[PDB]
Design a protein around this nucleic acid. Sequence first.
RNA 1: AACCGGAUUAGAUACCCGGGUAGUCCACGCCCUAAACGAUGCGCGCUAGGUCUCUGGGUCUCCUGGGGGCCGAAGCUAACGCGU
RNA 2: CGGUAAUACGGAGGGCGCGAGCGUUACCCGGAUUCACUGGGCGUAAAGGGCGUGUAGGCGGCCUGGGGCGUCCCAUGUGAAAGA
Lengths: 208, 150, 234, 138
Amino acid sequence: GRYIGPVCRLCRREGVKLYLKGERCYSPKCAMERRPYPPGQHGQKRARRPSDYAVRLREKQKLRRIYGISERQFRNLFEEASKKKGVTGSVFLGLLESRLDNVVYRLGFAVSRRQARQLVRHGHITVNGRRVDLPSYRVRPGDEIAVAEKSRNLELIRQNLEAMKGRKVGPWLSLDVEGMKGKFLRLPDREDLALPVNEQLVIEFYSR
Amino acid sequence: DFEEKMILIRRTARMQAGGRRFRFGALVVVGDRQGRVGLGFGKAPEVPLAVQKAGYYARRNMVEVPLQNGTIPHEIEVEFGASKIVLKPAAPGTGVIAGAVPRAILELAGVTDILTKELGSRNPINIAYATMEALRQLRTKADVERLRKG
Amino acid sequence: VKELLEAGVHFGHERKRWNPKFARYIYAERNGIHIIDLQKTMEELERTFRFIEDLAMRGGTILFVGTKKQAQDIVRMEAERAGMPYVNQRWLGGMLTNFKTISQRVHRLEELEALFASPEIEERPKKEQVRLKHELERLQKYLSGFRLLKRLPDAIFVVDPTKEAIAVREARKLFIPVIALADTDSDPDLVDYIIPGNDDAIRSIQLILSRAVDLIIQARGGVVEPSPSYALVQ
Amino acid sequence: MLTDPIADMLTRIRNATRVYKESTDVPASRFKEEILRILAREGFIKGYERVDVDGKPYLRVYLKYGPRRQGPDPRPEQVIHHIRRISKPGRRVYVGVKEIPRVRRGLGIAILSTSKGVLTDREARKLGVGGELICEVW
RNA sequence: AACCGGAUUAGAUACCCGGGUAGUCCACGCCCUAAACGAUGCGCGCUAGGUCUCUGGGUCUCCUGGGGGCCGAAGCUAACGCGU
RNA sequence: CGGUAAUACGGAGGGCGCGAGCGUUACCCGGAUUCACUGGGCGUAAAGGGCGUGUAGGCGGCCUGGGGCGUCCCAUGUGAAAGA
Ligand SMILES: [Mg+2]
Ligand SMILES: [Mg+2]
Ligand SMILES: [Mg+2]
Ligand SMILES: [Mg+2]
Ligand SMILES: [Mg+2]
Ligand SMILES: [Mg+2]
Ligand SMILES: [Mg+2]
Ligand SMILES: [Mg+2]
Ligand SMILES: [Mg+2]
Ligand SMILES: [Mg+2]
Ligand SMILES: [Mg+2]
Ligand SMILES: [Mg+2]
Ligand SMILES: [Mg+2]
Ligand SMILES: [Mg+2]
Ligand SMILES: [Mg+2]
Ligand SMILES: [Mg+2]
Ligand SMILES: [Mg+2]
Ligand SMILES: [Mg+2]
Ligand SMILES: [Mg+2]
Ligand SMILES: [Mg+2]
Ligand SMILES: [Mg+2]
Ligand SMILES: [Mg+2]
Ligand SMILES: [Mg+2]
Ligand SMILES: [Mg+2]
Ligand SMILES: [Mg+2]
Ligand SMILES: [Mg+2]
Ligand SMILES: [Mg+2]
Ligand SMILES: [Mg+2]
Ligand SMILES: [Mg+2]
Ligand SMILES: [Mg+2]
Ligand SMILES: [Mg+2]
Ligand SMILES: [Mg+2]
Ligand SMILES: [Mg+2]
Ligand SMILES: [Mg+2]
Ligand SMILES: [Mg+2]
Ligand SMILES: [Mg+2]
Ligand SMILES: [Mg+2]
Ligand SMILES: [Mg+2]
Ligand SMILES: [Mg+2]
Ligand SMILES: [Mg+2]
Ligand SMILES: [Mg+2]
Ligand SMILES: [Mg+2]
Ligand SMILES: [Mg+2]
Ligand SMILES: [Mg+2]
Ligand SMILES: [Mg+2]
Ligand SMILES: [Mg+2]
Ligand SMILES: [Mg+2]
Ligand SMILES: [Zn+2]
């Protein structure tokens, strides 16, 4: 069971806007607006120069919390990237980007990561014609991510796709907005991600 | 232009009649991440002034590091006193795998991928000194070629 | 601007206190004294004076440094014959590495001179009058040749790199090229451009420095009469 | 008696260059000669030549060094920074062709003695043979 | 040494003073320790010099071997220091 | 750490770390180049045997030739399945 609770507090504890709240991380209520300091009683106190360990810790958390994942799956994915051929740094990101929940969010089907997770969990997502209710399902390139026609008439899907009209999509993705289709064209490159995260620091958090 | 990061500060009290009277030691690295690093060690009766001196000495005593793709031309060991430092090149997607001290030095050198071991004495000052001398001893295929040309 | 028959003066020196590194410039041991190979000297003299003329006609500053009781007055006169600064009485710790700090002392020198040419000398008490009197006296003792160094010299000339090695250490450290008159007791490795020969024996020092300054002025086209220093031979 | 002539020659060279000697003599042995051929061929020494010292045959090794340098310690960089005997008596080191090291990530050499002659690590690799690992030079 | 006295001392089972047995010496046989120290195993080869000295040889200001010292190149050492 | 202002005890508020788990004890490897083949040492830090003679063993100057035991190369059989 993933992290469930106040989220726009981690927006603060990381120091960077975390869009896990979906909307309202855009409207000036995110609490990253006019409250950029971390939570707690000592939040407005002057923070001490962090330890070298502290830096790689806050970078890993900054990424982990972004994708909304337990430490377990997070580290197993990382070690998977450490074994695979290619740059561990970008391979890991391509793997996190390949989560079905993350793709759903990325395809604009859901406002947020969490919402994408619930949408997958409840089987509203099609993959190549088949229902898939696992947020962890690894999307491959060439997979068609659709919306179950059962739910196509639901007002939350039409609500989000309504604002997806004319909105542009990631260069490794493409979607048809009327038929509620979508496709994973290829793995994203480092440059394909705007993630405010230094991968090297994370790799360097796991060398210990 | 020039980025500095600090290694350690210490208390180094000295004795005198009536009581102790302390200096402050500061180890500071200064690098451009472009292959130029420099190390300085300052002492002063207050912490900040000592740090200043360390930065000023770090801009003197500079080292031209021959990076090859964010890593090193060849592996070297260097013995400084009783402290031995071991640097080995690393393929990309590796990171700086190094102690606290050589991590700081290598990072400000612009090294993004390297393998490292501290050996013998682990003293921060000698480990820094040893890292610097190690970097002074790096040589490029160009440099070796021009050394055995004749 | 050369010499050949100068075997008539400078043959050798330093009976058996030799630096072994000087062995490359030794001809033999005659009557229990090291006699310096004559031809070798002129080789190093060509290579040295080439650098001298080049640096001179470029406009560079050369610090002439000599404290030997043999070379004091010579260094004074020949360094004044050129536009070059000298060090005569004692080479002070830091004159190059602390050049800023030592320069402050020349500012005090000029300050007290300009207060000694003003009517205010008697405006101050008698005791301060004697004090500042002493300040100007010793300042003008040490910095009389060091006065005109505005920046760090572009070269250094030393007459015994063994006794003046405290200077050569600082020229080394700051990468200033080092020109030296070095006999058998000297480490030649530390000298960038060497002239092997007696560090003692005024007769030969006057020749070497006189010719050197001559070449200096010849680089800039200010042709000069014989050097006034020849009367210091006796 | 001289215990390991090769370590002795390696060392004569090491010491000789540490004081920047122009030349140095080492007692003549064909195997030594074949080593000096690789040092020469690889530009580590100026060269060598046979000589007679008081009737007995030696090899004059002419060493080379880099340029005289800048401020203090003008002493040149060395050409032979590191010479080390590897397979000594009483602990012998033979390598198969897949056991042959890469010396200084390329920039040095490993003199092998092979059944096909005294080769460098590159020569012995491209020749497809291994043998006794004589020494590192770099 | 032990021991017998005389002193000193708060005490004196000691330092100081008067004595004195083993022993210290010899032979022969045991014992096998040690700050048994260069606190540095032996052999060979290579790496600046200068100086004092013991003892050989030489065409004998000196050159050349073998010992014993002191400074010190390169280098080594944590440092002290080591350094043909 | 605590002997009157405790960020170390006890509670609370708050925060960090993991999360159907979280901590603890035991045991194994790691860090430990701290048994040093890779990869350590012995003047003063722990470590040169009190000294010699010498047995076994270890080690072996220069040239050539035979052999091909170690060494190196090629082919081939083997190296079960699982695991990796
Ligand atoms: Mg990888
Ligand atoms: Mg793509
Ligand atoms: Mg690891
Ligand atoms: Mg060392
Ligand atoms: Mg050591
Ligand atoms: Mg230790
Ligand atoms: Mg370079
Ligand atoms: Mg003075
Ligand atoms: Mg002299
Ligand atoms: Mg006169
Ligand atoms: Mg009594
Ligand atoms: Mg009594
Ligand atoms: Mg008493
Ligand atoms: Mg004794
Ligand atoms: Mg030993
Ligand atoms: Mg014997
Ligand atoms: Mg002696
Ligand atoms: Mg005699
Ligand atoms: Mg004796
Ligand atoms: Mg002797
Ligand atoms: Mg030294
Ligand atoms: Mg000594
Ligand atoms: Mg010898
Ligand atoms: Mg109270
Ligand atoms: Mg209280
Ligand atoms: Mg208290
Ligand atoms: Mg508390
Ligand atoms: Mg606690
Ligand atoms: Mg508490
Ligand atoms: Mg609580
Ligand atoms: Mg689970
Ligand atoms: Mg458990
Ligand atoms: Mg353990
Ligand atoms: Mg181990
Ligand atoms: Mg142990
Ligand atoms: Mg242990
Ligand atoms: Mg040890
Ligand atoms: Mg003791
Ligand atoms: Mg001991
Ligand atoms: Mg002994
Ligand atoms: Mg003992
Ligand atoms: Mg043999
Ligand atoms: Mg045998
Ligand atoms: Mg044969
Ligand atoms: Mg065979
Ligand atoms: Mg097989
Ligand atoms: Mg199998
Ligand atoms: Zn937010």
